[PDB]
Enzyme design. Structure first.
Site, PDB file in Angstrom:
ATOM      1  N   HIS A 104      -3.128  -0.483   2.308  1.00 52.20           N
ATOM      2  CA  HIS A 104      -2.022  -0.349   1.364  1.00 52.20           C
ATOM      3  C   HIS A 104      -1.718   1.113   1.062  1.00 52.20           C
ATOM      4  O   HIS A 104      -0.549   1.524   1.031  1.00 52.20           O
ATOM      5  CB  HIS A 104      -2.343  -1.090   0.072  1.00 52.20           C
ATOM      6  CG  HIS A 104      -2.308  -2.576   0.201  1.00 52.20           C
ATOM      7  ND1 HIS A 104      -2.314  -3.412  -0.893  1.00 52.20           N
ATOM      8  CD2 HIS A 104      -2.266  -3.379   1.289  1.00 52.20           C
ATOM      9  CE1 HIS A 104      -2.276  -4.666  -0.483  1.00 52.20           C
ATOM     10  NE2 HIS A 104      -2.249  -4.674   0.836  1.00 52.20           N
ATOM     11  N   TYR A 142       1.796   3.224   1.749  1.00 53.75           N
ATOM     12  CA  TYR A 142       2.563   3.970   0.727  1.00 53.75           C
ATOM     13  C   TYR A 142       2.770   5.411   1.193  1.00 53.75           C
ATOM     14  O   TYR A 142       3.850   5.974   1.128  1.00 53.75           O
ATOM     15  CB  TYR A 142       1.854   3.986  -0.630  1.00 53.75           C
ATOM     16  CG  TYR A 142       1.870   2.656  -1.341  1.00 53.75           C
ATOM     17  CD1 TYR A 142       3.023   1.990  -1.718  1.00 53.75           C
ATOM     18  CD2 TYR A 142       0.660   2.045  -1.664  1.00 53.75           C
ATOM     19  CE1 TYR A 142       2.999   0.787  -2.374  1.00 53.75           C
ATOM     20  CE2 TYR A 142       0.652   0.843  -2.322  1.00 53.75           C
ATOM     21  CZ  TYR A 142       1.806   0.174  -2.700  1.00 53.75           C
ATOM     22  OH  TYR A 142       1.744  -1.006  -3.369  1.00 53.75           O
ATOM     23  N   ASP A 202      -0.301  -9.445  -0.085  1.00 56.28           N
ATOM     24  CA  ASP A 202      -1.728  -9.132  -0.149  1.00 56.28           C
ATOM     25  C   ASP A 202      -2.208  -8.943  -1.585  1.00 56.28           C
ATOM     26  O   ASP A 202      -3.349  -9.296  -1.917  1.00 56.28           O
ATOM     27  CB  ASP A 202      -2.032  -7.889   0.682  1.00 56.28           C
ATOM     28  CG  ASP A 202      -2.474  -8.225   2.086  1.00 56.28           C
ATOM     29  OD1 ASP A 202      -3.134  -9.267   2.262  1.00 56.28           O
ATOM     30  OD2 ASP A 202      -2.163  -7.451   3.015  1.00 56.28           O
ATOM     31  N   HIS A 206      -5.307 -10.706  -3.654  1.00 57.02           N
ATOM     32  CA  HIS A 206      -6.337 -10.016  -4.440  1.00 57.02           C
ATOM     33  C   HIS A 206      -6.396 -10.543  -5.869  1.00 57.02           C
ATOM     34  O   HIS A 206      -7.485 -10.723  -6.436  1.00 57.02           O
ATOM     35  CB  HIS A 206      -6.066  -8.510  -4.484  1.00 57.02           C
ATOM     36  CG  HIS A 206      -6.077  -7.843  -3.148  1.00 57.02           C
ATOM     37  ND1 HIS A 206      -5.682  -6.535  -2.967  1.00 57.02           N
ATOM     38  CD2 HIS A 206      -6.453  -8.294  -1.932  1.00 57.02           C
ATOM     39  CE1 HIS A 206      -5.804  -6.215  -1.692  1.00 57.02           C
ATOM     40  NE2 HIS A 206      -6.270  -7.265  -1.042  1.00 57.02           N
TER      41      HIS A 206
END
Ligand SMILES: Cc1cn([C@H]2C[C@H](O)[C@@H](COP(=O)(O)OP(=O)(O)OP(=O)(O)O)O2)c(=O)[nH]c1=O
Ligand SMILES: Cc1cn([C@H]2C[C@H](O)[C@@H](COP(=O)(O)OP(=O)(O)OP(=O)(O)O)O2)c(=O)[nH]c1=O
Ligand SMILES: Nc1nc2c(ncn2[C@@H]2O[C@H](COP(=O)(O)OP(=O)(O)O)[C@@H](O)[C@H]2O)c(=O)[nH]1
Ligand SMILES: [Mg+2]
Ligand SMILES: [Mg+2]
Lengths: 738, 375, 341, 109
Positions: free
Chosen positions: B118, B122, B237, B241
């Protein structure tokens, strides 16, 4: 909260006229709340806000309120957006005189001047008498959004909107029927405009956004082949550029280039794989198109007996360094019955360099017994450079990548050859367009603009099975559609002489259908149980016979096509004559129409358009009709279509009366009933059909999807006579309600 | 003490979630809890590299959109980059010593790897739309609001690893170090662990969903479409989580391991209510920091505050706590289009589809049952 | 001490690889180490899963195998399962508090994830060929040979973890806690770190390679082709991990990052060399016990012993140490053409 | 072998025809183990309409990478890899973006 005109002139707040606009938009509907719209919209109103934002935010706030219980907000938002379109275009609501508008637009250089050169002021006045402006209210929200964002004549680098949908339709009709004897061309225009603005016939994005304007490339799909030489590769790249610059989706048959390790120039250099050339074609197609009306898309084909197929099957993957991946070009694998039997027997499949085996490549397509003989002989020969891969391994790898990346399309060649309107010996079929949807013969080039090559250009259209009430309107619509499409075939502007040669010599077409789900679910049937085989047989016999009869009338009236002596409709063979016999056990409806009389008629005279029918995905063009995107079932009673012109909510048609009769994509127990429906369609339709597959792990034990089931669905799609397999839509339980 | 392989054999079906024995060899057949193995499989099948969504049109859309919207987008991305660095680094070192079951420890490691991807994503969609990634990534660390949010999150991780180092070096009870007495109480260690878990749940529940709300409200208005698709994959995702942490701490609190843990659950439950209130206040202040230069279309202080209130209501109700606000409706009802990925018929050849499932097929061919198939 | 979000803003291109300010932001544009960037790139490229390989013929062949072949195969699998369980859990806790560059941090995270996938691969191979993976894993935990190896491995690891917790808790100097005398020191911490890294290098370069040689010599006879494919993928991933660790050791010892680390490596060369030699001897004794019922299907003990000699000598000469054997030609050439293509 | 190949200086106009011809020439020469220098500075910059507002223009980067993928194709079995240098004027609207096309601080796209 002060309002601001489009040029800076501020003004005191005035929300009651906007409330009056909302009361006009929501007039004559049910289960809506303009009060809720006001509450949701009156928060994003800062001081001195414009009107080009008041209207945008109020349309968004009244459009996000579409759901499975208040389905009239779609009409509410569509009416609001069409009011905004009229405002932005013509200042006021009252549309202008058609003649004044067209002359102003030709002054701006937007339309074409042949309109004014051909028609006169009186003809434009009596055409203004035809237009039905209050028909605009019949649009859906996704319809208006796609229309505005992609179709209406507009400035791109500024964002200005000129015309309306009524003018779009009337001028498409006018420029379609301007080369006809003045006695009846006005009646043809009136009838075609009625039939196209009543959503009785859909016409794709290329022609729908192109036949008013000086830009002339209306062929939706393009097919190019690529020889084994640098000059031919340069010609292919130049063609890709010159066509994707003009709103065209490409299908490249690149599976002729030699493979890695093959010697060059009589044995002094050595090849370096086809990954550089694939990258070159990708950069060609992705470069000069992104700014246009749409993006550039190109499918690339190869035969699975290719030497490098073990390294080319993956290129569309998700796990790899750029240096050995090309992941913006859909791929296509060409497979046939010899490969299938090597799979079933569990034996090894061999791989040869497709430029180091004489005649084997064109044997693969033309005659399967020749393919068998040459395959066996070259396997036996012990001096060629060949590789050997187990068949279960290779097919499982192919289906693995197909499921993993969704976009490894499958093409069965032997059906495209042994069931077609072209003969396999003088004009075989070696590829398909981007969407694995059509199938036409081509030939490799040597220069960019020579005459010894062909590039197959094909235009499209479709019927709306959700508007017709019988099976004679289909024949009338067929004659109108074939007239219009032949008009475009002769009216286009071909940037390449080879493609001009091919398109003018074959006059190929494609006419499919949309709204099939609404049709088949208004007739109280389903996709899964297998209760629609008879209805599919009947409907597609009607479609194909009416298309052939209209094309025969047109051929009688204005001569045949200049290459008929190379089709399979001259020797008198029809789809019902050459369909696949295994379609017998799954359908028992008899033939209705006078097929033998039609056969003798076309035998004596000939056909105008060498290829009539083809079934299309119809992703964008089927939204203006508020229809269902072809032969596919919807995914929800409020489906969300996602394009670069905004994500759009779309209520399946007549949901309030059919909220229990549809069969959404995620309710069928499998894809076998749908594969059988597609097999029957393919039997009755000349060229290929774009068929998807579905797989939901939540309908399997241990959350898996069995490769046995994948291979069984593939072998069934082959056994029941389906030429190609398009998608692999894979579910994933990403649920988050909120 | 800690060791990476304990020789004392034990039935891993009877060991508690946390604080048990240092785990033996990892096996995935006799599994105690099924939710964590299911999540391991799902996130092994959700694999996605960031370079699969060509965003070349979105560079143009960004360098064309105005200055305050540039600010909004780049600020949200900077904040998320920092917090996903922190949260791809922390779980490993904090919760890894306190694991007694292999399914849970490998779920922790897979969660850390997912957060690594992730942060890479970004950074990738920042390195694309601008030409000054240096100044952007330096303002990341330097900026005051970014720093204060990151501190508010990382304090709990720091305290928890501190107490765990105490408990693994000295032992249980009262002890004297460097001429000073410390009281290493396993009960207080468990309480700090539950507090850390609830703070992480708050973080991956409300904050990141506010950020996603902003970055998707951009792409509702025909802009930054590829970036919206990447952040759509990321929101998928992140929901996964969220459900993982939710089930973890709910199983701990319900009373499946210890009634003393249930009493700690009551006390720290009051404490976690007063923690969630602070988290929501921080998010409201971040909202009125972003939306000061003027609103965009369909997103401002009022709407984003409404969204914070509603999402805190929902996350509380789902985590077994009270309700601090009124159970109002959803202010941005168009976020279900980006979260629910079931009825979204995306049109390919234009925009990539985020519905693949990497390698989730059996691949055990029954070649004889195939041989009984005449073509 | 230790924290997860440092509050300052340091020049991340200047901080040493180890024992510096803990990272605060994950940054990818300014890469101080192209090695540990290309490593994570190639590892994200090499992603895979067990649920791609076919093992049915594997199960049938295992049923139709000899008893001693079942023994050797399942025992080697036990060995590598223990190895990769240790490797899946240790690096995070053992190193992540000690790292001061985000490149290396993310590399270690993907390393741990790769070892998790390896462990899942092994359990998937097991529960498809036999019926009692329960007793398989219990004999794993209880078997004294692989236990002996685990002693050394996890001893290095937890010694390092203990010293790092001390250094992150108390500080430096000589301290007293509960009435004892503990003397933490950055020099001894760096020494223990270097020894642990040499241990990880020897593990990733020797043990797994003996296991892969055994499994591939098995698959050469045209049995266990699913295991052949899976162990090929795992040998690829492990060669990647080995290159990463070797470059880490070279960047530490070469004096480019810390002259203190250079001097400490020059001091502990002896311990590194002896650890390597002891590991290799453990491998050959494990092989000796492996060949208890005679020998495998088309091999002996001499060939595998010379293979272990070859691999350990090559990895040693590569990492920058002496040569402990009299090298000869490659005894088992085909092995090197089965793992990386 | 009547082929003694070295540098090649080529100019690329502002038209799809000229760009097609340029890419064809550069691939035809790189196949001969040469090295290319292109004056691609004439290609109009991003945002300038195409066909009088009919279409939007994407910039110079697509065509630059097109020449790159053309030049990098098949000179690996020879003497020189695909080597090329482009030229452009400083007053070009997109010089602040074309000056940063060689550093690793940005994504491939
Ligand atoms: C028509 C078109 C042009 N272009 C770009 C590529 C060329 O560098 C540039 C010049 O193309 P031209 O070949 O000059 O097109 P044109 O002459 O019709 O344009 P104009 O009317 O403005 O003179 O335009 C596209 O990228 N896509 C397109 O579809
Ligand atoms: C000249 C050359 C060709 N090729 C590849 C690209 C083309 O697809 C393929 C065909 O090249 P051709 O242009 O057909 O070369 P040729 O006709 O002179 O060689 P031959 O007589 O043997 O057919 O060779 C290279 O890879 N590198 C090279 O240097
Ligand atoms: N370049 C390009 N071609 C497309 C796109 N969509 C469709 N096509 C081509 O158009 C043909 C028919 O597509 P269709 O779904 O009917 O498009 P529509 O009629 O405009 O909605 C296909 O064979 C494609 O080759 C696109 O987004 N880009
Ligand atoms: Mg040649
Ligand atoms: Mg021009």
């Amino acid at each position: 909260l002060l309002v601001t005109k489009r040029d800076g002139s501020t003004e005191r707040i005035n929300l009651d006229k906007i409330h009056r606009v909302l009361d006009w938009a929501a007039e004559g509907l049910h289960n809506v709340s303009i009060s809720q719209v006001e509450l949701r919209s009156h928060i994003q109103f800062y001081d001195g806000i414009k009107t080009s934002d008041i209207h945008e935010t109020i349309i968004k706030a009244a459009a996000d309120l579409i759901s499975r219980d208040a389905p009239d907000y779609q009409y509410l938002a569509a009416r609001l957006a069409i009011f905004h379109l009229r405002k932005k275009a013509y200042g006021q609501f009252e549309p202008p005189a058609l003649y004044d508008h067209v002359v102003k637009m030709v002054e701006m250089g937007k339309y074409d001047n042949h309109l004014l050169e051909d028609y006169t002021e009186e003809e434009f006045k009596q055409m203004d008498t035809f237009i039905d402006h209050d028909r605009d209210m019949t649009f859906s929200y996704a319809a208006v959004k796609q229309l505005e964002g992609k179709y209406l004549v507009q400035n791109r680098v500024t964002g200005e909107i000129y015309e309306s949908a009524q003018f779009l339709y009337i001028l498409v009709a006018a420029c379609l029927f301007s080369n006809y004897p003045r006695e009846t061309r006005l009646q043809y225009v009136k009838r075609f405009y009625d039939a196209v603005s009543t959503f009785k016939i859909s016409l794709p994005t290329p022609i729908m956004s192109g036949v008013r304007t000086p830009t002339r490339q209306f062929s939706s799909c393009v097919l190019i082949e690529c020889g084994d030489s640098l000059d031919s590769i340069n010609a292919t790249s130049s063609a890709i550029v010159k066509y994707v610059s003009q709103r065209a989706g490409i299908g490249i048959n690149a599976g002729r280039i030699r493979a890695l390790g093959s010697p060059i120039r009589g044995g002094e250099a050595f090849h370096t794989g086809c990954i550089p050339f694939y990258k070159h074609f990708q950069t060609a197609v992705k470069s000069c198109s992104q700014g246009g009306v749409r993006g550039g898309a190109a499918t690339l084909f190869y035969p699975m007996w290719h030497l490098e197929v073990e390294s080319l099957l993956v290129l569309k993957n998700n796990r790899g360094v750029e240096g050995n991946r090309v992941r913006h070009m859909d791929y296509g694998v060409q497979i046939n019955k010899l490969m299938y039997t090597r799979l079933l027997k569990g034996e090894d499949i061999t791989l040869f360099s497709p430029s180091d085996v004489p005649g084997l490549y064109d044997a693969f397509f033309a005659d399967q017994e020749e393919f068998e003989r040459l395959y066996t002989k070259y396997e036996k020969d012990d001096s060629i450079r060949k590789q050997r891969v187990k068949a279960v391994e290779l097919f499982s790898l192919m289906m693995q990548e197909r499921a993993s990346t969704g976009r490894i399309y499958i093409q069965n060649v032997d059906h495209c050859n042994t069931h077609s309107p072209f003969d396999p010996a003088i004009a075989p079929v070696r590829q398909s367009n981007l969407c694995l949807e059509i199938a036409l013969p081509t030939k490799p080039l040597n220069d960019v603009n020579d005459e010894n090559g062909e590039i197959a250009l094909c235009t499209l259209s479709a019927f709306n099975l959700g508007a017709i009430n019988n099976l004679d309107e289909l024949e009338e619509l067929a004659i109108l559609a074939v007239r219009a499409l032949d008009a475009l075939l002769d009216y286009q502007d071909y940037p390449i002489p080879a493609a001009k040669r091919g398109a003018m010599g074959r006059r190929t077409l494609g006419i499919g259908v949309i709204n099939f789900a609404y049709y088949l679910a208004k007739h109280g049937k389903r996709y899964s149980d297998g209760s629609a085989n008879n209805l599919t047989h009947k409907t597609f016999e009607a479609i194909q016979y009416y298309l052939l009869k209209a094309s025969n009338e047109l051929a009688k009236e204005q001569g045949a096509c200049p290459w008929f002596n190379e089709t399979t409709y001259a020797k008198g063979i029809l789809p019902i004559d050459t369909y696949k016999k295994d379609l017998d056990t799954i359908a028992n409806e008899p033939l209705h129409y006078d097929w033998e009389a039609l056969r003798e008629s076309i035998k004596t005279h000939g056909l105008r358009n060498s290829t009539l029918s083809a079934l299309m995905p119809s992703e964008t063009s089927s939204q203006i009709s508020n229809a269902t995107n072809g032969i596919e079932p919807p995914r929800g009673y409020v489906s969300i279509k996602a394009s670069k012109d905004g994500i759009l909510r779309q209520v399946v048609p007549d949901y309030e009366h059919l909220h229990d009769a549809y069969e959404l994509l995620w309710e069928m127990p499998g894809n076998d009933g749908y594969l059988q429906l597609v097999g029957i369609m393919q039997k009755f339709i000349d060229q290929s059909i774009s068929a998807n597959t579905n797989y939901d792990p939540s309908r399997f034990p241990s959350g898996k999807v069995p490769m046995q089931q994948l291979l069984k669905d593939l072998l069934t799609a082959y056994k029941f006579g389906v030429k190609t397999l398009y998608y692999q839509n894979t579910r994933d339980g990403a649920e988050d309600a909120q | 003490a800690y060791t990476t392989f304990s020789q004392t054999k034990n039935d891993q079906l009877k060991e508690p979630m946390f604080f048990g024995q240092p785990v033996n060899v990892a096996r995935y057949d006799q599994q105690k809890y099924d939710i964590f193995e299911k999540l391991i499989e799902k996130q092994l099948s959700f694999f996605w590299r960031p370079e699969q969504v060509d965003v070349s049109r979105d560079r143009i859309d960004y360098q064309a959109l105005p200055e305050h919207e540039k600010h909004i987008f780049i600020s949200n991305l900077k904040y998320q980059t920092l917090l996903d660095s922190i949260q791809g680094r922390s779980p490993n070192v904090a919760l890894l010593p306190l694991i007694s079951i292999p399914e849970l420890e490998t779920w922790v490691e897979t969660w850390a790897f997912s957060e690594t991807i992730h942060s890479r994503s970004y950074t990738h969609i920042i390195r694309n739309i601008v030409n000054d990634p240096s100044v952007v990534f330096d303002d990341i660390v330097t900026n005051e609001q970014i720093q204060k949010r990151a501190e508010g999150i990382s304090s709990y991780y720091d305290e928890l690893i501190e107490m765990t180092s105490y408990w693994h070096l000295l032992g249980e009870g009262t002890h004297t170090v460097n001429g000073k007495t410390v009281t290493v109480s396993l009960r207080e260690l468990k309480k700090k662990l539950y507090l850390c878990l609830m703070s992480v749940n708050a973080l991956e529940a409300i904050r990141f969903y506010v950020s996603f709300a902003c970055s998707f409200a951009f792409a509702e208005r025909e802009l930054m479409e590829g970036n919206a698709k990447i952040i759509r994959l990321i929101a998928r995702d992140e929901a996964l989580h969220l459900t993982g942490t939710q089930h973890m701490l709910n199983l701990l609190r319900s009373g499946a391991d210890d009634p003393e843990m249930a009493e700690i659950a009551e006390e720290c439950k009051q404490e976690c209510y007063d923690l969630f209130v602070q988290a929501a206040q921080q998010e409201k202040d971040w909202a009125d920091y972003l939306f000061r230069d003027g609103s965009m279309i369909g997103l401002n202080k009022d709407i984003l505050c409404q969204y914070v209130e509603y999402i805190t209501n929902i996350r509380m109700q789902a985590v077994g706590l009270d309700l601090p606000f009124q159970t109002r409706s959803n202010p941005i009802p168009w976020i279900n289009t980006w979260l629910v990925s079931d009825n979204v018929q995306v049109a390919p050849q234009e925009v990539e589809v985020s519905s693949y499932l990497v390698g989730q097929i059996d691949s055990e061919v029954d070649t004889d049952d195939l041989s009984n198939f005449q073509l």
